[PDB]
Design a protein around this ligand. Structure first.
Ligand SMILES: CC(=O)N[C@@H]1[C@@H](O)[C@H](O[C@@H]2O[C@H](CO[C@]3(C(=O)O)C[C@H](O)[C@@H](NC(C)=O)[C@H]([C@H](O)[C@H](O)CO)O3)[C@H](O)[C@H](O)[C@H]2O)[C@@H](CO)O[C@H]1O
Ligand SMILES: CC(=O)N[C@@H]1[C@@H](O)[C@H](O[C@@H]2O[C@H](CO[C@]3(C(=O)O)C[C@H](O)[C@@H](NC(C)=O)[C@H]([C@H](O)[C@H](O)CO)O3)[C@H](O)[C@H](O)[C@H]2O)[C@@H](CO)O[C@H]1O
Ligand SMILES: CC(=O)N[C@@H]1[C@@H](O)[C@H](O[C@@H]2O[C@H](CO[C@]3(C(=O)O)C[C@H](O)[C@@H](NC(C)=O)[C@H]([C@H](O)[C@H](O)CO)O3)[C@H](O)[C@H](O)[C@H]2O)[C@@H](CO)O[C@H]1O
Ligand SMILES: *[C@@H]1O[C@H](CO)[C@@H](O[C@@H]2O[C@H](CO)[C@@H](O[C@@H]3O[C@H](CO)[C@@H](O)[C@H](O)[C@@H]3O)[C@H](O)[C@H]2NC(C)=O)[C@H](O)[C@H]1NC(C)=O
Ligand SMILES: *[C@@H]1O[C@H](CO)[C@@H](O[C@@H]2O[C@H](CO)[C@@H](O[C@@H]3O[C@H](CO)[C@@H](O)[C@H](O)[C@@H]3O)[C@H](O)[C@H]2NC(C)=O)[C@H](O)[C@H]1NC(C)=O
Ligand SMILES: *[C@@H]1O[C@H](CO)[C@@H](O[C@@H]2O[C@H](CO)[C@@H](O[C@@H]3O[C@H](CO)[C@@H](O)[C@H](O)[C@@H]3O)[C@H](O)[C@H]2NC(C)=O)[C@H](O)[C@H]1NC(C)=O
Ligand SMILES: *[C@@H]1O[C@H](CO)[C@@H](O[C@@H]2O[C@H](CO)[C@@H](O[C@@H]3O[C@H](CO)[C@@H](O)[C@H](O)[C@@H]3O)[C@H](O)[C@H]2NC(C)=O)[C@H](O)[C@H]1NC(C)=O
Ligand SMILES: *[C@@H]1O[C@H](CO)[C@@H](O[C@@H]2O[C@H](CO)[C@@H](O[C@@H]3O[C@H](CO)[C@@H](O)[C@H](O)[C@@H]3O)[C@H](O)[C@H]2NC(C)=O)[C@H](O)[C@H]1NC(C)=O
Ligand SMILES: *[C@@H]1O[C@H](CO)[C@@H](O[C@@H]2O[C@H](CO)[C@@H](O[C@@H]3O[C@H](CO)[C@@H](O)[C@H](O)[C@@H]3O)[C@H](O)[C@H]2NC(C)=O)[C@H](O)[C@H]1NC(C)=O
Ligand SMILES: *[C@@H]1O[C@H](CO)[C@@H](O[C@@H]2O[C@H](CO)[C@@H](O)[C@H](O)[C@H]2NC(C)=O)[C@H](O)[C@H]1NC(C)=O
Ligand SMILES: *[C@@H]1O[C@H](CO)[C@@H](O[C@@H]2O[C@H](CO)[C@@H](O)[C@H](O)[C@H]2NC(C)=O)[C@H](O)[C@H]1NC(C)=O
Ligand SMILES: *[C@@H]1O[C@H](CO)[C@@H](O[C@@H]2O[C@H](CO)[C@@H](O)[C@H](O)[C@H]2NC(C)=O)[C@H](O)[C@H]1NC(C)=O
Ligand SMILES: *[C@@H]1O[C@H](CO)[C@@H](O[C@@H]2O[C@H](CO)[C@@H](O)[C@H](O)[C@H]2NC(C)=O)[C@H](O)[C@H]1NC(C)=O
Ligand SMILES: *[C@@H]1O[C@H](CO)[C@@H](O[C@@H]2O[C@H](CO)[C@@H](O)[C@H](O)[C@H]2NC(C)=O)[C@H](O)[C@H]1NC(C)=O
Ligand SMILES: *[C@@H]1O[C@H](CO)[C@@H](O)[C@H](O)[C@H]1NC(C)=O
Ligand SMILES: *[C@@H]1O[C@H](CO)[C@@H](O)[C@H](O)[C@H]1NC(C)=O
Ligand SMILES: *[C@@H]1O[C@H](CO)[C@@H](O)[C@H](O)[C@H]1NC(C)=O
Ligand SMILES: *[C@@H]1O[C@H](CO)[C@@H](O)[C@H](O)[C@H]1NC(C)=O
Lengths: 173, 317, 317, 173, 317, 173
């Protein structure tokens, strides 16, 4: 993908995350766990639903048209009727092929983008208290229990509370 | 010690393959089909008004072939013509048959109003063994076969004004006798002529005497013609023989009506989109069932499947 | 203490809604309209050469109906036919009227050159009370109604070579008399015939005697035909009665000319794109004014508005 | 947007910035101020003007065509004339709808991108003298007067001048 | 001291300009052309079966003009008609020539089967100096010019059943004599008539006597007609004069065959896509050589070049 | 480009890199050198080849159609034949123009993206041992000989080996 996270620096997906599309796994003093991120999940789903809304249940009414099958040979007029229809079908077939290719490229890129956005947001929130390990994980340089991990997930983590501890751990020998 | 916090995304064990700009095969977590590829094999009788032609073509229902008497004055959104349909009356052709079929189909009505044409001096209501109605010799219900009376066929010069606020469609014809002798037996003079005109149009027809292959023991033929008469205009029929006369006019409407060739049974069900294969669901934007459609229908395409991604790239463990 | 430095972007209090791939409604700072939805209600007389038909159809200007004498030999880029137009000469029809109208419209010229046809033995210049010019009985200016002379109509067999370096268009006709008696009064013999041919084509017409509804007290009719003659070819007219003869030929050109039905007044103004509603500006790529257009025009679409974003997402405080 | 800045980590726009599309607000020892960034503004405007140039004033000439309105019923030939035109109009209508949707998605994404690029450039320029607060703002850890702020905006800021001061402020207890 | 590590990308001294959504000119490292703009100037004889008409139109090869005898019974994927082609037999026309040309072209075969029609009482095999074969007066090979025998032309009433499992195409005509006297010399009675019918169709033709411009010293003309007869149907020819009779039928096939107007020489070479200019390579998706094509061809567009980027933005030092 | 690297923060390309599309230049204790990165190069090339595969050698067969040139004037039927063809050609011409513009925008953006991805990957790998100079270069704050540079290029660089050295050099006065 064009943002480099999904099938990129995130080595693979999580088959065991069934309650969201994006989320967090942690290891700390109390164990290891998983939680879905609902905002990123919903952002991706809303975009996809917006596409679907444009394409599903939106058909156009046509009534009396031209004939498209013929029981007898006629020449010029029938040649024209047949060519008009073949022309139409080829143009719509092209439109359908391109539409799906563009839509699908865009769906892959937008879902890649949502993963990247969540990663970037978390990175900034952690300030000088963590380092990016390169695989979508952060090493957090302070004791960070379940409530602390929860605060990061909920956007209530105060980096200033832990900064002295973290800097001492990061910049030792 | 500290902690580790990893960001990630879901994956599924059963992903689906889709196409993008650069890859004709890439796996995503989920997708939906955009091409409708099946019909239910019957034409739903709702919500469009369906008229099943059964053994009758539209043109035979118009002219009034005896097997088509049940169709008189009926309307439709969609007239369904069956491949088994056959004519069982006097043998005829219609120069530009396809156009008459089309204009009646689009009008959507067989409503017919009788008119009292002044046919003085001729025998009316000619019949034939080629067109049996209730076991008796008969003829097309909407046409009046005029022949000699007392060995005379005095020239016809007959007017019918249109004082309505709508257009009238008139169907009429010319009889082509098998021989010069049959010409005399029927019409008294050796050569017939027909002129049918309005203020804005004229049509002149001469019969063509000769043998055609027998159909229901008849080697002669009738050729069918039509004329539209607008409000304030007048139909003028001027003829010295061979006229197959109108009995009145058909109403001509405009609207959403059509005709379809199909052998699919009619079902008691409700579906917006009709194809010759049967009704199809119309949730998807495209379909590859049939290029012939009526109603609110997906657009016909050549592809048998087009999968729209509805999830991210699938990257299993 | 230190400092804070914030990066940001503008916003407006009055944003505009546009559509994207995923949202049918998203607000941006600015947008522009891509569908032209209005006309100025007049057809600008520049920069295309406009010919206002006034009371004349193109075909009446061609044949030379008396109200159309002012149109002789004129050219156009766009001929404008008015809904009020009416014929005021001998009643006629044109089998394939639409094609003759189209080919003359596309040619873009009424340029006519008289030719001296050898009509020996017949009366020329027949006229009628149905076609008044300067208070006198008259006829179509470009046609020559030939009739008997001294109770004889000797057969016509007349040649006109094309030794020009361009094609000639010939317009001619057949008179259909009301009765067998009027056939005799006019043409001396009971039945007329016309053959008009070149080396590469032939057209054979027989008159059809009969009553039509009266138009300007005339129950007979004329049917109009045409023939193109290429350089080095020859027109041959061979006839024993009923010919409405050409007086010469029209030049036939190729180029960008056309015809439009409209009741919009002609204005003294300059606009590239013409529709039947009036001229439209052509800055936008699309328009929903009319599917009928002439000139450098936006493309017709069904949408009444399509807004192109010309700014970023609008995110007000 | 797909870059996550506009309507993303930048909470909202600035109605009071009327002389550019992107820019800077600061607070320091001498007050608080705003200045537009002309290069980013111009980059976005040039791209949008390039789109407009492809679409405005570019009409195509047509002359004699087919008839599209009819005073009489005719059947087969008229059915074909009508179907050819309806077919054409539906294909152009589709083309217009898709064009505008693609163009508008792209305009939103490119303007999002220009905001992100300016942010990233400034981040790099500041080196170890500032920290990203997560909302499009940097905390600058040294005295940075109006001339200093100006130097950042103009690309003449020398991070080495302030680095000792900044590191002392960042990594204290 | 330490180190510096720089990330970068390639560039070339000779970049190429392409178009994007926002820029009509941006330089990339490499591109490829998507519009085929040239032909090799000859039509390759492989892999499609090519039939070069040489001096013969398809219709002249059908009827059997003497210069076209070499074409009997041949098939084609593509019949190539040359601008130099000319007729050299009895002068004729074909009402709806374009349709007969088209249906034969699409059928792809001149396969002809002789049939023994019972022409009793007439002279067969009429010939003319306008149609020389081996220095002798002759006629179209597939047509049988019937004339009076012993100053009589007894009426013809002849049947030919189709008991095959395929359709038969019949080509026949009417002779239009120059004068009423030549009508008598050839056919004994003053007026001819033809009726050609099946169970599902009828065609009635009357000759039109008159002078046409001389072609190979002939001022008369023949008009050509056709009739398709389905399995289990019957051809019935009923005529009292002027019939140019069929000698049998042509097979009518369905498939991928066509016809093209071109003066390009045929080459010994192999190319899938044919245009009137010559064969074109078909690697590219688009072409601006010719809107007329046959085979697996790029699609015709108006652009003379469309460059697809195949590298990144080029940013030279 | 929409990622801001090529013709962006990377000032220009390298005409002397002829064995790959993306790569590395270094200066250290042993000299200065260049090496192509094959994975990024191949990623870009594979995407472009995927586009080409959809467009080259994929023509559609047509056989008997309608006539498109006429030797005589005819009116209505010929007007319709001509309009059907002109309509078709204009719709295909539009399709071709849009296809190439979309494809080319996408090729530029995807190649920009691959440059950005390689930069981001290297940045993360270096952890606290280097700083981003803003022009696509990193200042590495430890002795990094040819083998060390090679380890970075090959993804075998262990940041922990050099961290003490690097931190001392970065955060001195
Ligand atoms: C006017 C008349 O009586 N003519 C007689 C011929 O009809 C008859 O030829 C035989 O006709 C047979 C079937 O005939 C009908 C029919 O179509 O059923 C009888 C109808 O009453 C008659 N209708 C009218 C209105 O006159 C009708 C009509 O004559 C023809 O259809 C017109 O072509 O014919 C059957 O076709 C036999 O094969 C045929 O020999 C001859 C010989 O008996 O006598 C005529 O007087
Ligand atoms: C040849 C001739 O004089 N015929 C006489 C009939 O015209 C006439 O019938 C009456 O005709 C009335 C109007 O007549 C004109 C006309 O169209 O104005 C007079 C024209 O001079 C004549 N033109 C030529 C070139 O001969 C023209 C022509 O005969 C007809 O239009 C052809 O159809 O007719 C009006 O129509 C009356 O209603 C009608 O009775 C009869 C009876 O008076 O006498 C004929 O000798
Ligand atoms: C039946 C017959 O013999 N008629 C004689 C006329 O043909 C002849 O008119 C002259 O005809 C000249 C060329 O004549 C042929 C031809 O086309 O080559 C001779 C053919 O044998 C004959 N074919 C048949 C089957 O009868 C054919 C045919 O009559 C015409 O083509 C039909 O239109 O004519 C040439 O055209 C001269 O210019 C012309 O005067 C006249 C006068 O000699 O005598 C007739 O008996
Ligand atoms: C002109 O040629 C046609 C075609 O061959 C001849 O038509 C045929 O006429 C015979 C005799 O009337 C028809 O036979 C009849 O069949 C019916 C029922 O099948 C039967 O009831 C009669 O007793 C009689 O057997 C035959 O069907 C018919 N053929 C066709 C194809 O229509 C016609 O007679 C010829 N005319 C002359 C004057 O010779
Ligand atoms: C249109 O209708 C009119 C009126 O009915 C027809 O005119 C009439 O035609 C008849 C039949 O040809 C004429 O009868 C003949 O009259 C002559 C007079 O010399 C007589 O010798 C014959 O024995 C025969 O009876 C009649 O005169 C005539 N009537 C009038 C009032 O004009 C006309 O034929 C019809 N046209 C068509 C195309 O059907
Ligand atoms: C055949 O039928 C037609 C149609 O009914 C008859 O035409 C009608 O003929 C009458 C008598 O000539 C026409 O009346 C005339 O009207 C004009 C002006 O309105 C007036 O100047 C005359 O004094 C006379 O009143 C009538 O207009 C006309 N109708 C139509 C619709 O054209 C025709 O006479 C019939 N032919 C025969 C031989 O019976
Ligand atoms: C084309 O033009 C030629 C030449 O004018 C026409 O041929 C001529 O036709 C007239 C009228 O039918 C003939 O007059 C008749 O001649 C016979 C001879 O037996 C006579 O008994 C009759 O009383 C009458 O006068 C004339 O013979 C004839 N002339 C020549 C030189 O052939 C021809 O009719 C025109 N064709 C058409 C379709 O108009
Ligand atoms: C009716 O008008 C036509 C057209 O003007 C006349 O046709 C012309 O007839 C003459 C005399 O037969 C033809 O001349 C001949 O030319 C050939 C070869 O060029 C030569 O072998 C003969 O000795 C003679 O000179 C002339 O070609 C022909 N013109 C056309 C255009 O076909 C026709 O004769 C007229 N009919 C009557 C009865 O007056
Ligand atoms: C279709 O073929 C049939 C049968 O050949 C044709 O019928 C026949 O037509 C001829 C020529 O007109 C008739 O001859 C005439 O008979 C009368 C009897 O009164 C006589 O007076 C004349 O001198 C002349 O010989 C014949 O009677 C008739 N035969 C039969 C068995 O009906 C018919 O003409 C052909 N139809 C067409 C359109 O060609
Ligand atoms: C719907 O009906 C159409 C028309 O009968 C079917 O298309 C035909 O399929 C047969 C058998 O595979 C082919 O031989 C013909 O070429 C097709 N006919 C035409 C006229 O194109 C189609 O398969 C049906 N579709 C469904 C879903 O029932
Ligand atoms: C076009 O025709 C109209 C209607 O026939 C003409 O206007 C009439 O002219 C008559 C004759 O002089 C007057 O008596 C009337 O006052 C007019 N009637 C109406 C309803 O306007 C008009 O003059 C013609 N136009 C041209 C340019 O010739
Ligand atoms: C331009 O003229 C067209 C044609 O008259 C107008 O479209 C018609 O609008 C009426 C009234 O709303 C409808 O009843 C018809 O269905 C339309 N006619 C046709 C032939 O489609 C159109 O509204 C006009 N547009 C402008 C901007 O003036
Ligand atoms: C096609 O027709 C041309 C032109 O009529 C033929 O070439 C002429 O043949 C004649 C008769 O033998 C020669 O006297 C001339 O030298 C040729 N004239 C010209 C202008 O080339 C040619 O032979 C015909 N081709 C075929 C394949 O039959
Ligand atoms: C292929 O042939 C076509 C048709 O002859 C050529 O297009 C013609 O080019 C001439 C000369 O430039 C123009 O005057 C005509 O307008 C064109 N004719 C038609 C019918 O459009 C075309 O140039 C040829 N292309 C190649 C590559 O040879
Ligand atoms: C974070 O939010 C979750 C979900 O609402 C809640 O259950 C949890 O108690 C919160 N934890 C903290 C530490 O804020
Ligand atoms: C995938 O598997 C799940 C679990 O069995 C099933 O419910 C679902 O329908 C499948 N969906 C797709 C799109 O493969
Ligand atoms: C920065 O540039 C602005 C605009 O040209 C100028 O007015 C200002 O003096 C510059 N300031 C510094 C500190 O370079
Ligand atoms: C890195 O990989 C290259 C290419 O295979 C190899 O030649 C080199 O020895 C490697 N260097 C190190 C330090 O791993």
């Amino acid at each position: 993908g064009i943002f480099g996270a999904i099938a990129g620096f995130i080595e693979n997906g999580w088959e065991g995350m069934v309650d969201g599309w994006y989320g967090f796994r942690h290891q700390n003093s109390e164990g290891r766990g998983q939680a879905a991120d609902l905002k990123s999940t919903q952002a991706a789903i809303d975009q996809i639903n917006g596409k679907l809304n444009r394409l599903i249940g939106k058909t156009n009414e046509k009534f009396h048209q031209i004939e498209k099958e013929f029981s007898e040979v006629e020449g010029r007029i029938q040649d024209l009727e047949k060519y008009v229809e073949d022309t139409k079908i080829d143009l719509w077939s092209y439109n359908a092929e391109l539409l799906v290719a563009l839509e699908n490229q865009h769906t892959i890129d937008l879902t890649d983008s949502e993963m990247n956005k969540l990663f970037e947001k978390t990175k900034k929130q952690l300030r000088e208290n963590a380092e990016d390990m390169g695989n979508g994980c952060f090493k957090i340089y302070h004791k960070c229990d379940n409530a602390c991990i929860g605060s990061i997930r909920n956007g209530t983590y105060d980096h200033d509370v832990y900064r002295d501890e973290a800097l001492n751990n990061r910049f030792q020998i | 010690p500290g902690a580790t916090l990893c960001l990630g995304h879901h994956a599924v064990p059963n992903g689906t393959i889709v196409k993008t700009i650069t890859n004709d095969q890439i796996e995503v977590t989920n997708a939906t089909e955009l091409v409708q590829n099946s019909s239910i094999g019957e034409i739903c009788d709702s919500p469009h008004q369906i008229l099943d032609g059964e053994n009758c073509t539209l043109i035979d229902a118009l002219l009034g072939d005896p097997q088509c008497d049940g169709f008189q004055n009926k309307k439709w959104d969609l007239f369904v013509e069956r491949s088994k349909a056959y004519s069982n009356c006097y043998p005829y052709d219609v120069p530009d048959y396809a156009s008459l079929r089309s204009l009646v189909a689009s009008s959507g009505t067989l409503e017919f109003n009788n008119e009292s044409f002044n046919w003085t001096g001729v025998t009316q209501n000619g019949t034939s063994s080629a067109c049996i109605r209730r076991s008796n010799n008969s003829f097309f219900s909407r046409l009046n076969w005029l022949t000699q009376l007392n060995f005379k066929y005095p020239a016809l010069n007959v007017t019918m004004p249109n004082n309505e606020q709508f257009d009238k469609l008139y169907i009429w014809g010319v009889h082509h006798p098998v021989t010069d002798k049959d010409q005399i037996f029927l019409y008294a003079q050796s050569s017939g002529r027909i002129t049918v005109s309005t203020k804005r149009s004229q049509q002149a027809v001469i019969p063509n005497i000769g043998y055609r292959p027998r159909i229901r023991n008849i080697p002669s033929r009738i050729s069918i013609y039509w004329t539209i008469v607008k409000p304030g205009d007048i139909l003028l029929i001027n003829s010295t023989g061979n006229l197959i006369a109108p009995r009145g006019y058909f109403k001509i409407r405009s609207g959403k009506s059509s005709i379809m060739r199909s052998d699919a049974p009619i079902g008691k069900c409700n579906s917006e989109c009709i194809t010759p294969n049967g009704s199809i669901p119309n949730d998807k934007p495209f379909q590859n069932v049939n290029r012939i459609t009526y109603g609110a229908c997906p657009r016909y395409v050549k592809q048998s499947t087009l999968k729209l991604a509805t999830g991210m790239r699938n990257v299993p463990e």
